[model samples]
Target: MVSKGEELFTGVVPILVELDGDVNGHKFSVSGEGEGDATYGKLTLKFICTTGKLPVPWPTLLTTILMCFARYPDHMKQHDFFKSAMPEGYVQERTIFFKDDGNYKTRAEVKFEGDTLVNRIELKGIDFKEDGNILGHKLEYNHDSHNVYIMADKQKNGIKVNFKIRHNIEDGSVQLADHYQQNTPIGDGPVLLPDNHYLSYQSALSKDPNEKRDHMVLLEFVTAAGITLGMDELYK
Candidate 1:
């Protein structure tokens, strides 16, 4: 399992997110800075919300995303780090615990209940995923190789979460370019860097009739080659 301190193997992908058109005229933005070498860099994420009415619990959401960076890699090395691991066709659950300055506390678990894997995520009073809350998601893993497959077909208020992460078989790594294209169904996709710099996307829908949310991030890694990309275009 990759410890929090050694999660990111190398490189820092600085990210900036600005989102608007939420409830109560709330504006949200986040920026992260990293230090140290690519193999053991540490990242600090900051959240700025001019108004206090964020649609989702900002602190919890932020912590949840950061926690994922550590858990997914550990999950990959359930039994061994060199080879892949899977608990499919069996009942299994894994839990992770961590502490961060008392501001962000972490306790997360994944349950392979039947054919669907349910995640129980909680940070302070925030609940990212609830019990039996299967939002049309699926996962596939191969024990022979270092790839994890996840498919999302969930939607809220016309905002759909549909994407995939393909692992780089050569070196369990991820490239921003792979996420730009339509994902393969399952099996041996590119992997994200243990700790690398990459772009992110954010979007939201609200009851405000006069609201317009058109904020998205385009990666120069993918865009420089004359390829077109589209994300949520959130918080504008």
Candidate 2:
């Protein structure tokens, strides 16, 4: 049988997202610095991810939102990330991510049973023109302990629990994934890397393992570009 990770992979695309589709969750945009100061001193990545699904009722969604405003310990900070662009008191919140599906047979989505939130995330566009055609990458999220493990739909060594958060503040501090550094073919997509700098990914991590309850959150990311580029110049 196909795993949840496999299911997410079948749904990823590799382009900037258009607000034409009907989707639910807290989505937003994020900006940061990348490798090339010449072309990417400033770069933006869209993130469409969510959390807090603990089988909560609609009222709980409201409660959770209110709790965040009051700064509850477990209250999520995803809304803070998009406050600048969101409307005044935009009660229903979501995270935003970018993907281009014009290339490969890629797709991604998530399912759960809590009021959890995917905190501090972003995505980038990747173009691989090896055969002069489009190719796609697959991604997934799995829950184990207070960690969210990740895997490319097909790769045994994609990445896992790389992104992390504190769940204690409106704008929670974030940390990078621990294992993506061992990656060889660096490129752009759900998890990205600049030429010689730090690699980026849309994921979460935990410090208080026993205190944080976790679940399975999966991602399916696609890339139109195949791996024709070399990684020799990326290492320090």
Candidate 3:
């Protein structure tokens, strides 16, 4: 019987979005989730491509979905419940690697409050070898809530992809803020993933059920064609 926290916790048991939709007229199926005991209240949401060509990765659109489901996670919002992490050096057992043959590199950052292994983020990063641009997705526990932000390619003025993802557990719903002239997210689970959207793993952590948690949804918010775009406001 292996104990927990002995293996990397990032993307090993992903909860994918089993969603369907079209992006730029191309059809794709997509997929987030994790171990029950180890990932109870935390969010490790992801969208992987499978069963089709899927949609091209659009920066703003990607962030839109990322932020939509992320809208301030409830389990993390209780300020009193989550005390500050170890101020100085504390025992942090960890490992780092890539999933699905170098798909997205899973940077394992984890914390434990004694026996139970809680407070984990499966941070992911990808690269566009064609154009040599890098996209970085980060998990941040700040601003008094559970927030996810992104960083696209570099630009002048030091402005990159910087914005928070939004969501509502109360309704499992989301809508853009007033800055827009009345716009909302698409049916936006807008792509496909390959077989077994979630990469499986066995570990010294919790048991692996060999299943994936699927959230279904259906989107058409396109910007590549045309937008009243500007620098800084636009994510590279």
Candidate 4:
């Protein structure tokens, strides 16, 4: 079994947001327990889509959800957890990827106590063809309490999209935060993943539903300092 670390300690599991785009929206999902192998483990959390419009890939838009959720977690703020990861009924043993527009590619990065919280996530490179020619790329997440920032595209300075939150559902005992905002917290599960190991919301959700109804939310999370994972920690 893979050794547990700080990054994999805890956080909100994968929660998908339905963006306004095509009729078929996107979904994000994650699954895993504390410490165990890829195939053997318990599913922590499974965030569902909570939007009813066009499902578009918006950064600034998603950032708002990240902040809102950061302040108000799923299991209550007093939990004193570590990271946010997969939801309650999903599986995240061997599936983690990044999201952008309608395409997705694997990208990840990390920060450790060795360097403090001052580093950029290495964008997972995507080879267009089989010749090694790169076509698209994106930033990575370490799953630590590490803060993941947003960078403008090549020519732009501001983030890409506009975000929103709504939790006023017509269900039972609906939390206010869940009404205008669908926040998922990985309190302290990231310590289970590797330092460099990370997961993106786009790559974690369910399949496309169809039309704007098929919502999908793509986001990232990390742990704090002193939490280390990999050979250097154990070997050194």
Candidate 5:
């Protein structure tokens, strides 16, 4: 993760978001800066939004996108790092806690629950499986993975409340699980990162109590390319 790349853009350039795919019947090109390495350098990794509507809780969509980054060699060791991120706009005064029942094994837990200030939410999800060949890095393919029933603590507008995800390596796509297709689905298909796009990250100070004195730095990130607020939204 590159802090320098992100710092240069946070208050400078509008965080660009590029969307490509079928959202119901409408097609959208919601985009920020299309490429990052040359423009932002190592800032927040670029994420393409392929879902129908941007998720409300934010993390529901952000973390699920990180699932693809987890398989990258540079990010594999940071599996726990992504879990510790305190994404911006999450009401910093109040905090959140993540529970690691087990790493990423099936039936094992990856839980985050805590005060989101005025509103509190818990994002509890479990690993379903891995070794899927949906997306490929180099020659080896098997980054396909799934998370079932990511449940938010309560129901509220702008919040998805509950959803499932399947990350494919084929195109670094993140898509909705079949459960949503029964009646209401998040979107059509092929939630993608484009062909050559990648998810960048920045190293951050660890705030988790359990990690006190731990030398390794945890990572921080924003959903999509990055955060927008105040006049920031207009800049992008």
Candidate 6:
């Protein structure tokens, strides 16, 4: 694995998210999990579309996945023990490419630097492509009951997307309210991702039957529109 001082630990297995949902007559799905090492905090959380006409060509789809990790700093943040583990200024980057056969691939990176967060994306093997930086500011969390709310404003390709994520600390349930908004052309106008298009996630924590570690996280993702797009068992 690639690293910049941080070491990547790999005792955890790969987790998958099962997806379901349809646009018009087409159905789609999304899968996700935490990757890299858990010892030195080199974990990378990712959500991928695995079924039905998943978004392609990179940034558009990859950005959504980045949002997941952007909210949770150390792979998982529901546990109070890991609260202080949140970085001050976190930075991450992603890249996507399209092939002649209409296929897509991506590369992403992230880190923290004091009070500034940095992110970059590069697209390869495509004709009409996009590559740039995704600037993520420090995140603030408001704890409530078994859930926590994280509000942040992210800018990419001159476009900004506001995120409001609610995560359940007890059961790992996540609800990204519809308050998320995107503005294209800088300050041209509002181009929302449509109303009631929020994302709902569910997670399960189980003890490693063979190890003495705590619990491994399992994941699931669905849309407000009644589309179940992902399921997770383990992660790399």
**CA RMSD of all predictions:** 21.1, 20.8, 20.5, 18.2, 19.4, 21.0
TM-score pick, better of 1 and 4: 1
List the candidates' TM-scores in order: 0.23, 0.18, 0.23, 0.20, 0.19, 0.23
Distance (Å) between predicted and true CA of 61, model 5?
9.3
Tens digits of per-residue lDDT for model 2, 1-236: 43211121122112222111111222323221111110111212222213332221111111011101111011222212111111111122222122222211112211111221112222222332322211211211221222222223225212221323212211342212122111211222222211111122222322233433322212221111112334676662
lDDT of each: 0.24, 0.20, 0.24, 0.23, 0.24, 0.28
Q: Between prediction 1 and prediction 5, which has the larger TM-score?
A: 1
What is candidate 3's local distance difference test score?
0.24
In angstroms, how far off is 84's CA in candidate 6? 10
**Local error of candidate 3 at residue 144 (angstroms):** 18
Please give, for residues 1-236, the per-residue lDDT of candidate 1 as tens digits: 43322233234534332333221222343322222122222333333344433443322233232212222223332212111111111111112121111122323332223422233333332222222111111111111111222222222101111223331222453211011111111113222222211222221212224433321111111000111355676933
Q: How many clashes would you count in candidate 4? A: 91
Which run of 10 residues does model 3 get worst, by summed lDDT? 191-200
Where's the lowest-lDDT run of ten residues in candidate 5? 100-109
Those runs of model 4 whose alpha carbons end farther than 4 Å from true positions after fitting are 1-57, 66-214, 217-221, 227-236
How many clashes show up per model?
23, 52, 20, 91, 11, 28
Query: Tens-digit lDDT track for model 4 on 39-119?
Result: 111122222334332232222122222221232222232221212232211111111122221222221111222312111
Q: Write the per-residue lDDT of candidate 5 for residues 1-236, one digit (tens) a residue.
A: 42321222222222232223221232322222211221222323333333343322122223322221122233222221222222221211111111211111111111122211011112223322223221111111121232222222122211121223342323554433332211111222211111112233333332334533212122333221321244666676
Better of 1 and 6 by lDDT: 6
- What is candidate 2's local distance difference test score? 0.20
Model 6 residue 163 CA deviation in Å: 4.2
